[PDB]
Amino acid sequence: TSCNPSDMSHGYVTVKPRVRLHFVELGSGPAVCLCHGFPESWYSWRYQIPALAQAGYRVLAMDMKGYGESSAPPEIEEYCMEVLCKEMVTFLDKLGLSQAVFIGHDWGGMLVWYMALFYPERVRAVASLNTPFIPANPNMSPLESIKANPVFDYQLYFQEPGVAEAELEQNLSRTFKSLFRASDESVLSMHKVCEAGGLFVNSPEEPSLSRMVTEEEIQFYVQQFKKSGFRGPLNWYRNMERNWKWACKSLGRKILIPALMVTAEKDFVLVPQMSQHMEDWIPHLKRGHIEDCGHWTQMDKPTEVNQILIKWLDSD
Amino acid sequence: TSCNPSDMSHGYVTVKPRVRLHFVELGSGPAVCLCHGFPESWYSWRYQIPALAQAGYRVLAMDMKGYGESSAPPEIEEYCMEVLCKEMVTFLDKLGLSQAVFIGHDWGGMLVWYMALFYPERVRAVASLNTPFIPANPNMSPLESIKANPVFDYQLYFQEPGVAEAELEQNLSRTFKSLFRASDESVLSMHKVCEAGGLFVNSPEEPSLSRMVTEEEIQFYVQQFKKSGFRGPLNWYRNMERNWKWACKSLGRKILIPALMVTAEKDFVLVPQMSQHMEDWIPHLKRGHIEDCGHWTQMDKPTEVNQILIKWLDSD
Numbered sequence A, B: 001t002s003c004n005p006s007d008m009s010h011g012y013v014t015v016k017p018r019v020r021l022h023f024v025e026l027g028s029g030p031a032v033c034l035c036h037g038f039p040e041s042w043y044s045w046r047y048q049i050p051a052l053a054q055a056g057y058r059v060l061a062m063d064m065k066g067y068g069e070s071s072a073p074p075e076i077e078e079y080c081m082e083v084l085c086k087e088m089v090t091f092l093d094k095l096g097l098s099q100a101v102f103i104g105h106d107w108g109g110m111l112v113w114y115m116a117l118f119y120p121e122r123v124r125a126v127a128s129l130n131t132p133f134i135p136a137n138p139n140m141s142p143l144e145s146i147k148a149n150p151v152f153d154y155q156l157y158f159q160e161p162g163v164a165e166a167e168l169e170q171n172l173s174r175t176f177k178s179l180f181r182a183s184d185e186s187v188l189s190m191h192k193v194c195e196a197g198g199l200f201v202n203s204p205e206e207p208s209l210s211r212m213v214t215e216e217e218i219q220f221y222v223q224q225f226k227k228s229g230f231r232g233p234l235n236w237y238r239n240m241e242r243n244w245k246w247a248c249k250s251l252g253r254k255i256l257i258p259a260l261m262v263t264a265e266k267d268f269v270l271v272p273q274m275s276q277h278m279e280d281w282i283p284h285l286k287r288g289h290i291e292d293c294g295h296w297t298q299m300d301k302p303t304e305v306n307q308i309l310i311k312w313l314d315s316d
């Protein structure tokens, strides 16, 4: 039911001179591109990859730009949505794929919505875990939105280059054990990160292992993040104004391709209600909802994710 | 239309601890595995890769074991057909492909025939360029056949490890310019190589560039063979007894899957008549024949090769 890295096919595509994207590939059938979130890995889809391949799909599980074996340039602007989306289009071009299904989670979810929005001709169908699609508001900036919702306070802490990197890189095992937990096992507040000083300022120095993960799984992420660290990943958060301006160029165009929104009951940041009016701008939207499921959806409720994704893939 | 290496998707599969296979991958649809000959490269399929992908296939063009970015262990036994075939099956396993169409040329052609014989469950259909399928004769050794068939004298020269390697690696540019030519541009013979002292003993020191290839194309081969040299590739020739004994264990069984044999009029070693009685053992065999075509079929007559392969793939 899982993936051993050394038993996978590893693919590499150069999308521009010094930027190549790494992916793992399994199965035959229609192409399904899986896009993980922050701070994760292709390996976050470990339970989906075999299930989707067994269900008759060709699965391409990405290391997103900044992660794993994919390139991680230091410049903030390399990680704006416009650049990341164009790169994923180039990825498809070099692989000779006219279209793929795009399934994303967290920041990967944001990316796949923008792929569906701006490059619908290359997106056969789109699915997001947790991350809603909300049309850009030309009137209020991203900075004003974060004031209007204090649950996104931590995003301010991620802004200054090097600050969050230092904390997240200091002890990688502690970082991932602290983060990758079921909602009832949480050891972190994301209410007021900035005044406290950081994410882990008064969370355990030696956290226990979540019921969700093994020591071996944790050590995989540890080894992956030794390659490039957290700068590239955090740069995803540092293009708020650029992403806003790009998203506003959408005007009011709808997403007319088949779409799936999957909500997670106990994700306390990307809460299910954030998705509530999505059918207004996505006419062919279908839904899934997973109870007792926190942020780390693929890990927390793999069986439920697999059922929902496969049902949806097979029907449209 | 051809391939630029830096614009391809490069895949890597570890089939056992010391051995990984490299391939380039283009297109969507049924999996088609392309297997090159001696001393070539995935790049020998450069004209077929985009044509087949455009025709609606997912093309996997291999660096065969011993070549390019694939592993090239020193031991002779690592290149016997039994080992090479098992590894190709493991390759399919790791990619999650239950079956593939196998298309081979030269030594690659011999490989795909053996795949069809011993692993019919993993081969959807089989095609060979130039290399016929001749059932093993248990009453004659391979060594005995080379004495009866002097055109294969050069194979005796390839036996002694280190000898052919030194000549072929002495000047790679000269090596490939001398080999890769149209039949009417020939600058060497394979009549009496051993007593002559080598392959290039009295062929030009600075050969002209064949009509078939550009300087840039030659230099790609040069660059590729700088990594591991000719030991691995030549080891394909140094398993005659093992291959013969293995082939003899398949005597009774037949190839029932769809099959294509493409002959080249001006291949003076793998002559068309070598294939003449193949329908005795494969009654449903289909055929293509290319006029004015030397040994390097894909390079020599790419348009004709593309037409024949696509017609065949689309019908059976």
Ligand SMILES: O=C(O)CCc1ccc(OC2CCN(C(=O)N[C@@H]3[C@@H](c4ccccc4)[C@H]3c3ccccc3)CC2)cc1
Pocket (backbone or CB within 6 Å): A038, A039, A106, A107, A110, A131, A132, A134, A135, A136, A137, A145, A154, A179, A199, A267, A268, A269, A270, A295
């Ligand atoms: O139009 C409008 O109003 C705005 C619409 C809009 C809607 C959604 C949206 O989500 C994107 C930005 C925020 N983002 C995260 O910060 N994920 C948290 C990671 C994290 C944060 C902090 C530390 C580590 C990891 C995850 C996490 C979440 C919950 C629990 C654990 C981890 C995910 C993607 C963007 C825009």
Ligand SMILES: O=C(O)CCc1ccc(OC2CCN(C(=O)N[C@@H]3[C@@H](c4ccccc4)[C@H]3c3ccccc3)CC2)cc1
Pocket (backbone or CB within 6 Å): B038, B039, B106, B107, B110, B131, B132, B134, B135, B136, B137, B145, B154, B179, B190, B268, B269, B270, B295
């Ligand atoms: O049962 C029976 O009668 C025997 C049946 C049987 C039938 C066929 C057969 O072909 C295999 C062995 C011979 N082999 C080569 O030596 N290829 C030559 C390369 C080469 C040789 C020498 C130098 C460089 C490259 C190519 C070449 C050929 C012609 C011109 C240029 C290059 C290709 C595969 C094996 C068994």
